[PDB]
Amino acid sequence: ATGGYVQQATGQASFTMYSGCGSPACGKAASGFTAAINQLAFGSAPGLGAGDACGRCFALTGNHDPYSPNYTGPFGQTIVVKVTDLCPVQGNQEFCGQTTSNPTNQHGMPFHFDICEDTGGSAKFFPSGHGALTGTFTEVSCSQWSGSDGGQLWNGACLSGETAPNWPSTACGNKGTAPS
Protein backbone atom coordinates (compact mmCIF):
# COMPACT_ATOMS: atom_id res chain seq x y z
CA ALA A 1 0.00 0.00 0.00
CA THR A 2 1.34 3.65 -0.07
CA GLY A 3 4.48 3.86 2.08
CA GLY A 4 5.19 0.08 1.50
CA TYR A 5 2.72 -0.97 4.22
CA VAL A 6 1.22 -4.45 3.99
CA GLN A 7 -2.54 -4.04 4.13
CA GLN A 8 -5.11 -6.55 2.85
CA ALA A 9 -8.67 -7.38 3.79
CA THR A 10 -8.20 -11.03 4.79
CA GLY A 11 -5.52 -13.39 6.02
CA GLN A 12 -3.81 -15.11 8.93
CA ALA A 13 -2.92 -13.31 12.13
CA SER A 14 -1.72 -13.83 15.63
CA PHE A 15 -3.62 -12.30 18.58
CA THR A 16 -2.85 -10.98 22.05
CA MET A 17 -4.59 -8.67 24.53
CA TYR A 18 -3.65 -5.38 26.17
CA SER A 19 -5.20 -2.92 28.58
CA GLY A 20 -5.35 0.89 28.50
CA CYS A 21 -6.61 1.81 25.00
CA GLY A 22 -8.26 5.13 25.89
CA SER A 23 -5.68 7.24 24.13
CA PRO A 24 -4.88 5.22 20.98
CA ALA A 25 -2.81 6.04 17.98
CA CYS A 26 -5.74 6.81 15.65
CA GLY A 27 -6.67 9.71 18.00
CA LYS A 28 -10.17 8.44 18.90
CA ALA A 29 -11.08 5.59 21.18
CA ALA A 30 -14.38 3.73 20.93
CA SER A 31 -16.86 1.96 23.26
CA GLY A 32 -17.12 -1.26 21.24
CA PHE A 33 -14.48 -3.96 20.88
CA THR A 34 -11.21 -2.47 19.62
CA ALA A 35 -7.75 -3.60 18.65
CA ALA A 36 -4.29 -2.36 17.85
CA ILE A 37 -2.83 -3.75 14.61
CA ASN A 38 0.85 -4.31 13.89
CA GLN A 39 2.71 -1.31 12.49
CA LEU A 40 3.29 -2.73 9.00
CA ALA A 41 -0.53 -2.97 8.61
CA PHE A 42 -1.45 0.10 10.70
CA GLY A 43 0.03 2.49 8.14
CA SER A 44 1.86 4.88 10.43
CA ALA A 45 4.61 5.05 13.05
CA PRO A 46 4.62 6.21 16.71
CA GLY A 47 4.21 9.99 16.72
CA LEU A 48 2.84 10.25 13.19
CA GLY A 49 -0.88 10.09 13.72
CA ALA A 50 -3.53 7.89 12.14
CA GLY A 51 -2.72 5.27 9.45
CA ASP A 52 -5.11 3.72 6.96
CA ALA A 53 -6.10 0.83 9.28
CA CYS A 54 -7.86 3.39 11.51
CA GLY A 55 -11.56 2.80 11.88
CA ARG A 56 -11.68 -0.38 9.84
CA CYS A 57 -13.59 -3.35 11.26
CA PHE A 58 -12.49 -6.99 11.22
CA ALA A 59 -14.01 -10.33 12.16
CA LEU A 60 -11.35 -12.20 14.17
CA THR A 61 -11.43 -15.97 14.75
CA GLY A 62 -8.82 -17.58 16.97
CA ASN A 63 -8.43 -21.39 16.81
CA HIS A 64 -4.91 -22.36 17.96
CA ASP A 65 -2.48 -21.65 20.80
CA PRO A 66 1.01 -21.55 19.23
CA TYR A 67 2.64 -22.03 22.66
CA SER A 68 0.49 -25.23 23.27
CA PRO A 69 -0.10 -26.63 19.78
CA ASN A 70 -1.96 -29.74 21.12
CA TYR A 71 -4.47 -27.74 23.11
CA THR A 72 -7.80 -28.32 21.29
CA GLY A 73 -9.86 -25.77 23.16
CA PRO A 74 -12.07 -24.32 24.25
CA PHE A 75 -11.05 -21.12 22.48
CA GLY A 76 -13.38 -18.06 22.32
CA GLN A 77 -15.93 -16.56 19.95
CA THR A 78 -15.56 -14.85 16.62
CA ILE A 79 -15.61 -11.12 17.45
CA VAL A 80 -15.70 -7.95 15.32
CA VAL A 81 -13.23 -5.27 16.36
CA LYS A 82 -12.60 -1.75 15.18
CA VAL A 83 -8.93 -0.84 14.79
CA THR A 84 -8.20 2.24 16.88
CA ASP A 85 -4.55 1.73 17.75
CA LEU A 86 -1.01 0.83 16.69
CA CYS A 87 1.07 -2.13 17.91
CA PRO A 88 4.49 -0.73 17.06
CA VAL A 89 7.51 -2.83 16.04
CA GLN A 90 9.53 -1.23 18.84
CA GLY A 91 8.66 -2.95 22.13
CA ASN A 92 6.57 -5.68 20.36
CA GLN A 93 9.07 -7.68 18.35
CA GLU A 94 7.52 -11.17 18.87
CA PHE A 95 4.01 -10.24 17.63
CA CYS A 96 4.22 -6.88 15.88
CA GLY A 97 7.77 -6.92 14.51
CA GLN A 98 6.81 -7.40 10.83
CA THR A 99 8.86 -5.14 8.52
CA THR A 100 9.34 -4.87 4.78
CA SER A 101 12.73 -6.65 5.31
CA ASN A 102 11.02 -9.47 7.41
CA PRO A 103 7.28 -9.36 6.83
CA THR A 104 6.19 -12.11 9.30
CA ASN A 105 6.41 -12.15 13.09
CA GLN A 106 8.00 -14.92 15.21
CA HIS A 107 4.86 -16.99 14.69
CA GLY A 108 5.10 -16.70 10.90
CA MET A 109 2.06 -14.39 10.84
CA PRO A 110 1.97 -11.41 8.43
CA PHE A 111 -0.55 -9.54 10.70
CA HIS A 112 -1.22 -9.23 14.41
CA PHE A 113 -4.22 -7.88 16.34
CA ASP A 114 -3.79 -6.81 19.99
CA ILE A 115 -7.32 -6.83 21.31
CA CYS A 116 -8.10 -4.25 24.03
CA GLU A 117 -9.37 -5.57 27.35
CA ASP A 118 -11.05 -2.32 28.47
CA THR A 119 -14.11 -2.61 26.28
CA GLY A 120 -14.59 -6.33 26.59
CA GLY A 121 -13.25 -7.82 23.35
CA SER A 122 -10.48 -9.85 24.87
CA ALA A 123 -12.84 -11.51 27.36
CA LYS A 124 -14.93 -12.84 24.50
CA PHE A 125 -11.96 -13.97 22.42
CA PHE A 126 -9.32 -15.54 24.62
CA PRO A 127 -10.00 -18.43 26.98
CA SER A 128 -8.46 -18.18 30.45
CA GLY A 129 -4.83 -19.23 30.36
CA HIS A 130 -4.35 -18.81 26.57
CA GLY A 131 -3.69 -15.11 25.92
CA ALA A 132 -1.76 -15.63 22.62
CA LEU A 133 -3.55 -17.29 19.69
CA THR A 134 -3.41 -17.60 15.93
CA GLY A 135 -6.28 -17.62 13.47
CA THR A 136 -7.71 -15.32 10.83
CA PHE A 137 -8.92 -11.81 10.19
CA THR A 138 -11.60 -10.82 7.68
CA GLU A 139 -12.35 -7.14 7.07
CA VAL A 140 -16.09 -6.53 7.31
CA SER A 141 -18.42 -3.55 7.24
CA CYS A 142 -18.55 -1.76 10.58
CA SER A 143 -22.30 -2.51 10.53
CA GLN A 144 -21.06 -5.73 12.16
CA TRP A 145 -19.40 -3.79 15.02
CA SER A 146 -21.32 -2.66 18.13
CA GLY A 147 -20.56 0.65 19.79
CA SER A 148 -19.66 4.18 18.98
CA ASP A 149 -16.57 6.31 18.69
CA GLY A 150 -15.05 8.62 21.30
CA GLY A 151 -14.23 12.29 20.72
CA GLN A 152 -11.15 13.69 19.05
CA LEU A 153 -8.07 13.44 21.24
CA TRP A 154 -6.08 15.71 18.93
CA ASN A 155 -6.42 17.57 15.68
CA GLY A 156 -5.87 15.07 12.82
CA ALA A 157 -7.49 12.15 14.68
CA CYS A 158 -9.19 9.80 12.21
CA LEU A 159 -11.47 6.76 12.25
CA SER A 160 -12.88 7.35 8.76
CA GLY A 161 -11.91 3.82 7.74
CA GLU A 162 -15.16 2.93 9.49
CA THR A 163 -17.16 3.84 6.37
CA ALA A 164 -14.69 2.81 3.71
CA PRO A 165 -14.91 -0.16 1.33
CA ASN A 166 -12.53 -2.89 2.34
CA TRP A 167 -8.88 -2.66 1.39
CA PRO A 168 -7.61 -1.98 -1.17
CA SER A 169 -9.01 1.54 -0.63
CA THR A 170 -7.84 4.63 1.15
CA ALA A 171 -9.65 6.42 4.03
CA CYS A 172 -7.45 8.03 6.72
CA GLY A 173 -4.39 7.29 4.58
CA ASN A 174 -0.90 6.04 5.49
CA LYS A 175 1.87 8.25 6.93
CA GLY A 176 5.59 7.89 6.45
CA THR A 177 7.33 4.82 5.17
CA ALA A 178 6.69 1.33 6.48
CA PRO A 179 9.27 -0.03 8.96
CA SER A 180 12.19 -1.76 7.32
Side-chain angles (χ1 to χ4, degrees):
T2 295
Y5 293 99
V6 177
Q7 292 172 328
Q8 71 200 53
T10 71
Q12 287 182 69
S14 47
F15 302 105
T16 54
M17 76 186 81
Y18 77 113
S19 61
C21 58
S23 190
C26 297
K28 288 175 173 179
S31 68
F33 304 156
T34 62
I37 201 175
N38 65 287
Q39 187 170 339
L40 187 58
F42 184 75
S44 191
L48 291 181
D52 199 56
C54 287
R56 297 179 181 277
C57 292
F58 298 83
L60 308 184
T61 300
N63 71 335
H64 185 67
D65 181 344
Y67 292 149
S68 294
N70 301 295
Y71 177 74
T72 71
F75 294 97
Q77 291 174 273
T78 298
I79 67 171
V80 175
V81 302
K82 178 172 293 186
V83 173
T84 62
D85 204 2
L86 166 62
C87 182
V89 167
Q90 184 80 47
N92 303 275
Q93 293 286 346
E94 172 174 1
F95 291 108
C96 301
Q98 302 91 340
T99 74
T100 56
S101 299
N102 185 1
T104 62
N105 67 195
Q106 287 180 356
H107 296 278
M109 296 291 137
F111 295 81
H112 185 81
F113 291 77
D114 206 353
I115 300 167
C116 190
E117 187 169 58
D118 306 357
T119 59
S122 61
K124 196 164 188 182
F125 191 83
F126 296 97
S128 303
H130 304 266
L133 299 176
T134 63
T136 63
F137 65 99
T138 306
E139 192 179 356
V140 294
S141 174
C142 293
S143 63
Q144 304 303 288
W145 175 78
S146 297
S148 68
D149 297 350
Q152 176 165 294
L153 293 160
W154 29 268
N155 287 87
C158 185
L159 291 176
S160 69
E162 72 198 2
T163 62
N166 289 168
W167 282 321
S169 64
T170 300
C172 297
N174 296 329
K175 312 294 186 283
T177 301
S180 62

